């Protein structure tokens, strides 16, 4: 939806300090969420559920 238009219009937004700060915070938050979901074990849980006894 609005994500495609936002993707097209990003070059105009990256001229204010606040917009760059928001982009950096969003990227860092997503990366950290991925890494600590991996550390928690959710990915391992789904991988094991996919291999529900079908391998060892």
């Amino acid at each position: 939806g609005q994500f495609i238009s936002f993707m097209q219009e990003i070059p105009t937004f990256l001229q204010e300090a606040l917009n760059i700060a928001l982009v950096a915070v969003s990227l860092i938050a997503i990366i950290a969420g991925v890494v600590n979901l991996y550390k928690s074990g959710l990915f391992q849980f789904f991988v094991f559920l996919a291999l529900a006894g079908r391998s060892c």
Partner: protein, 188 residues
């Protein structure tokens, strides 16, 4: 011309055609246009006059018609459209039929055309009337080529003439004419 000014932003222009504004209209709208300078024209209904300012006096008050009431124009020309256009032009230029000096007009029977002349000279007692006429002409005509110098005689004449097909078609002039004309009855 269209050109880009931002990342996705483009400067663009639109123009309005005016032949499709006048030729494609329900009513018949007055036409006011100028060739070069000091060559004013006017067109409404069938009548098409050529407003001309010059020092000489074609019509003198002693020999010709005196128009102080609009009904006195019945002695001006056979064509009623010419009378209509003259009356409404004089209303548009701000002429008051009760508080302004009368203007002359050639006798209808006298076979030298239809001419009406207005004393627009900015001299002495005629000063306020001349200034009001100047105001009216600036309203009706955009970039009005004034030639009535202060003090010197300046009497306008309106003769019928062929409408110049090579004349620019203005519309602000028509808008001002309709605004000042008050309760005008445009032929359909």
């Amino acid at each position: 011309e269209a050109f880009k000014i931002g990342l996705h932003t483009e400067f663009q222009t639109v123009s309005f055609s005016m032949v499709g504004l006048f030729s494609n209209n329900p009513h018949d709208l007055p036409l006011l246009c100028t060739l070069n300078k000091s060559h004013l024209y006017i067109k409404g209904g069938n009548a098409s006059f050529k407003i001309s300012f010059d020092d000489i006096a074609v019509l003198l008050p002693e020999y010709d018609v005196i128009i102080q009431h609009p009904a006195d124009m019945s002695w001006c020309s056979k064509s009623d459209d010419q009378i209509w256009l003259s009356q409404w032009f004089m209303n548009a230029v701000g002429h008051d039929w009760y508080l302004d000096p009368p203007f002359l007009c050639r006798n209808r029977t006298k076979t030298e055309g239809f001419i009406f002349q207005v004393n627009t000279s900015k001299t002495g007692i005629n000063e306020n009337y001349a200034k009001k006429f100047k105001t009216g002409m600036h309203h009706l005509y955009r970039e009005y080529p004034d030639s009535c110098l202060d003090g010197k005689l300046c009497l306008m004449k309106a003769q019928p003439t062929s409408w110049p097909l090579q004349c620019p078609l203005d519309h602000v002039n028509t808008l001002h004419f309709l605004t000042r004309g008050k309760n005008i009855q445009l032929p359909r």
